[PDB]
Amino acid sequence: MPLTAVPEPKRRFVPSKNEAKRVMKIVRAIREGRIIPPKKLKEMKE
Amino acid sequence: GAYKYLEELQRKKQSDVLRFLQRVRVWEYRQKNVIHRAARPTRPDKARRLGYKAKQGFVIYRVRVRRGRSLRATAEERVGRRAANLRVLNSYWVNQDSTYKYFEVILVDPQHKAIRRDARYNWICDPVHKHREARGLTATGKKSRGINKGHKFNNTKAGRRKTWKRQNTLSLWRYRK
Amino acid sequence: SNRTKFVRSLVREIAGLSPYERRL
Amino acid sequence: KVPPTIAQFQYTLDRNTAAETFKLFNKYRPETAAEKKERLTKEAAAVAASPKPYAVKYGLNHVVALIENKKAKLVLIANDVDPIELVVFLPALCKKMGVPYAIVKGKARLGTLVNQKTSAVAALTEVRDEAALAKLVSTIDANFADKY
Amino acid sequence: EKFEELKLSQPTLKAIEKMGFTTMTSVQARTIPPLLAGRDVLGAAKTGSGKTLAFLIPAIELLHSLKFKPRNGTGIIVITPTRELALQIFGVARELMEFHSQTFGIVIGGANRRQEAEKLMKGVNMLIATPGRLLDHLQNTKGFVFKNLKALIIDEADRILEIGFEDEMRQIIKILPNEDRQSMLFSATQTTKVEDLARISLRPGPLFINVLEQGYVVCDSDKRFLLLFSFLKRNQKKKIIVFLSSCNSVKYYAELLNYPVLELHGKQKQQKRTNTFFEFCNAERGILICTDVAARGLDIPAVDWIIQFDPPDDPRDYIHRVGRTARGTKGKGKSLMFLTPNELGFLRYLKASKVPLNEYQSQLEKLIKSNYYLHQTAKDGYRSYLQAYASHSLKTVYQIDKLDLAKVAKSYGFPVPPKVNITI
Amino acid sequence: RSQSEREEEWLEKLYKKHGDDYKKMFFDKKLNIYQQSEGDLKRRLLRWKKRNG
RNA sequence: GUUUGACCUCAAAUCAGGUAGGAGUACCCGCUGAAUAUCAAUAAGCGGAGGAAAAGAAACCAACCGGGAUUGCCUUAGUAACGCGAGUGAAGCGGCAAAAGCUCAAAUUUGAAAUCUGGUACCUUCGGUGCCCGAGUUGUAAUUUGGAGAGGG
RNA sequence: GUUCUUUGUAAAGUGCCUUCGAAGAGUCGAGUUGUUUGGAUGCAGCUCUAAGUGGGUGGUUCCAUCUAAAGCUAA
RNA sequence: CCUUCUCAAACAUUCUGUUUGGUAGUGAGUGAUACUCUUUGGAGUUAACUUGAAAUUGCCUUAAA
């Protein structure tokens, strides 16, 4: 039998909250106009 | 975590595996200068529990001291004198033999912006912490100073010289008691 | 703790016996 | 001539099975910093339901946390770790837990497949391909544990 | 009669009404007034007759009337041999305590010792305990409030005698206070040793009150779940009652099957507890997942099959219940006992009765690995099943060492045995 | 304190798909991306209803 | 492969960004230290800091119906104790001044090294942002420092 | 006070139920040799070297109190 | 140590229905009697079940150095 304890946290069965936080931070940056989406970067590559 | 396994293994110091490791490491160090920069600590558990962290700003130094002012105190003083721009935080034993005893000391550079902006480590940047080993403020220095609580340290609880001055002074008030 | 006891037993088996322990 | 707990290294997986294991592990390369950053930026732009990702486990502390839980199915151990005490007990821990383990020469080679300069250990918990993993585990067992 | 006809406190009557109970059973009616008067009692009240509430009501009334704070004693201690019966009693008591501020707790052998020890520091006034753990608790639980002992009672004296706790019960009673504390006990039957224990424990003069083919299947511990599921599918839409070791396992299995099968256990609310039984009885096609204690609560209605999946709480009780059912019904419900290949020693008990005998996964693994609630329910059911196996008396027939935890976990859908603090 | 626009949309989706069936809403695998408890779901839905309807 | 790459180690550059000596010294800290008990943890010497330094939140004091960081004063007290000889000499409790608790090692973020140094262009410049470079996996962030604490409802 | 912003299914607290629940080794300690104390303690070269319901400090069977071998912190 | 034969025609007018042809397989193992033929020289078919891709001998060189 395994020796450990502290049964599995919900985050292991749920999408990471850190990913959501990073996505929302990037969304805020885009709203502020300080981040260019990669699709727009492709156009600006001209 | 694995660090518990490392601590348990290090508990059995006289194990044949640790004997081989120590005799290999001492021989390897015998071909290096007395004091030299260490790429990484050889006892990660001890350094981690002593406050060392693997981030830009920390430095590990290995120093060799003649066997037979404690040996750890001498090592700390030597590393501080050589590493004038770094502050000695703590040190731990790593090897010994019939001729020499080896200790590892971890140092933090207060000039690096990483340490300066580290809320948990920027305290060492204060000028009052300069040359901690010089004043015996390190763990070994404090232990050698007899600083502790209880009857066993009444005469050396905080300052062996201070108590002598206090008991030798003549306090006289404006109105004599 | 059961985990601590298991780790201690594992370390005991790995490290063998000390030179002074081997005298027994 | 060294204590038996030492010299368990220098006996390692053969070239063919080691190459097969490396090829299998390369499939589950974790998303590097650049790839993860660009994917997150793309997701944010799209925002401005999801499957669980699969990747190899390489952190020594994280691997040891997964080990002794019996979740790890196959673990790779580097034989050139300077603090040998970090890995002397890992083979014994895996044997006690019944988790197959393979010693692969070169910590740098182990780390090259996980976007890191060096990596002491690597372990797999989830799989995409289960038959291939089982066959590799059986081959590694028959070629390493039954021989040494 | 009805509980409202007595001088019971308003919160107690409100709790009783919320429980759905309004009429008083014969044992309850006979015992409630004398016990509220503070007189001791002993009787052969069989399990499921309602003696639990009959004893609890006077004790809860005394707790309410005294108003003593948790720091001023230990309130009521209820010793129960079986873990399942202890859990059922605690659940029943919780219904009344829902309207009471007094603290309630449990001390069950096999549970986390540290948790119970820490809980004992809060001065629990409604405690359900087991004889085995009490010795160690009193030998090591420093600071445990143990002097007030408002009321101390025992249950299932026959099972305690069979287990052999009498040696521990003597020491527990000797350490227990010997003061105005009310003393009682109940059992399915009265015997010499039970009467001696009553005399030792009852200070005043007690207010005495009184009130076939066997089928089995041999299946591995891992295949048991799949075998049962296949048998139910082949016999689906029928009326069948399944007996399980623990309420948590019952809930887990019911939830898994619902993801056409009902549930009935002592952990569910009493109103729903009776509603589920009534619905199963009147459905003509319902399937019930329940435990032995809940089944003993009321006579089993006419059924087509009695699939005793988990081991019974008391082999003698089940052996007598099957015979009683065979006589009280014409369409006898075929019994389906499950015996582990390493548990074949039970055949001696079956033969002693002389009755005739007969010898009649990835889809859920992914769901467990993807659903947190289902995984938690499965883990709780596995833990409760292992604890129930630990809390047994036929140590020669049933042994944890004879069970492979990996196979049990596979039966429960876990790839690896989940952690359990069993005293192996 | 209020609820975010994305949070409001997520709440509205679940409310439309299951109404007040909290138990059914809990098991929605492709709308309940985060396995929120019944209590949290009902509290958030009540807050949304009070704020909007 | 009668080759080409991953690292690790070791050197160098008028490399870029940084710090170290020394002075002063009444007080502070450490080492050393005279004219077997006494002048003495003094005189002198060396090293290391600030406006204060050290110490600091007990493996404490007590044997009480217990107190609860460190520090200074009175008291304890010229008492206990010792060298019982000349002589040295405490500390708890009590009252007063001022009061503040915290941070790591330890059990998986693994459903996302989420951390940080530096370069570059701007702005609202004791800093912030987009990008890049490097450190980090032999552990950088959050979550816990026994007063417990952690996964869930 | 004055003015712009928050948000993100973000972070904490209260009571209850539930499942778990780590703790500084060449370190403590004993031996010996130098050193300090009016304290017999502590400091220091070196042989050995401890355990986890364990360890340290105190007395008549033990009972009272903490959890050392890391560090920061104004008055 | 790579990796698998991804529609042709006619009519159709329905936001497209029907026909033809197009389906050339890891092995071993178990299996309770039905359609056949050369009728001794053993061959083609017919429910059902197990499986680690399991197993003892049926008489064109830049995927380069």
Notes on the structure:
Chain E: This is ATP-dependent RNA helicase HAS1. Chain E: Its EC number is 3.6.4.13. Chain E: Its main location: nucleus. Chain E: Interacts with RRP1. Associates in the nucleolus with the 60S and pre-60S ribosomal subunits. It has also been isolated with the nuclear pore complex. Chain E: It catalyses: ATP + H2O = ADP + phosphate + H(+). The structure is cut from a larger assembly and holds chains A (about 45 residues), B (about 180 residues), C (about 25 residues), D (about 150 residues), E (about 425 residues) and F (about 55 residues). With about 45 residues, chain A is mainly alpha-helical. The radius of gyration of chain A is 19 Å and the shape is elongated. Helices cover about 50% and strands about 0% of the residues of chain A. Chain A is built from 2 helices and no strands. A 4-stranded antiparallel β-sheet of chain B has the order 1-2-4-3. Chain C has about 25 residues and is mainly α. In chain C, about 60% of the residues lie in helices and about 0% in strands. Chain C is built from 1 helix and no strands. Chain C starts with a helix and ends in a 9-residue tail after the last helix. Chain F has about 55 residues and is an all-alpha fold. In chain F, about 60% of the residues lie in helices and about 0% in strands. Chain F has 3 helices and no strands. In chain F, helix 1 crosses helix 3. The chains are: A mainly alpha (about 45), B alpha+beta (about 180), C mainly alpha (about 25), D mainly alpha (about 150), E alpha/beta (about 425), F mainly alpha (about 55). At the B-D interface, helix 1 and helix 2 of B face helix 3 and helix 4 of D. Chain B binds 3 RNA strands through helix 1, helix 3, helix 4, strand 3 and helix 6.
Give me the secondary-structure topology.
The structure is cut from a larger assembly and holds chains A (46 residues), B (177 residues), C (24 residues), D (148 residues), E (424 residues) and F (53 residues).
Chain A: H1 17-32, H2 38-44
Chain C: H1 2-15
Chain F: H1 5-18, H2 22-26, H3 38-51
The structure holds three RNA strands.
Percent helix among the residues of chain B? 25-40%
Order of helices and strands of chain F: HHH
CATH topology of chain B, by name, is Ribosomal protein L15e
Rg of chain F, Cα atoms, Å:
10 Å
What is the oligomeric state here? part of a larger assembly
Please identify which CATH superfamily of chain B we are dealing with: Ribosomal protein L15
User: Gap between N and C termini of chain F, in Å?
Assistant: 17 Å
* Overall CATH class of chain B: Alpha Beta
Strand order of the largest sheet of chain B: 1-2-4-3
Radius of gyration of chain B from CA coordinates: 20 Å
PDB class: ribosome
Keywords: ribosomal assembly state, ribosome
Entry title: Nog1-TAP associated immature ribosomal particles from S. cerevisiae after rpL34 expression shut down, population A
Chain A: Ribosome biogenesis protein ERB1
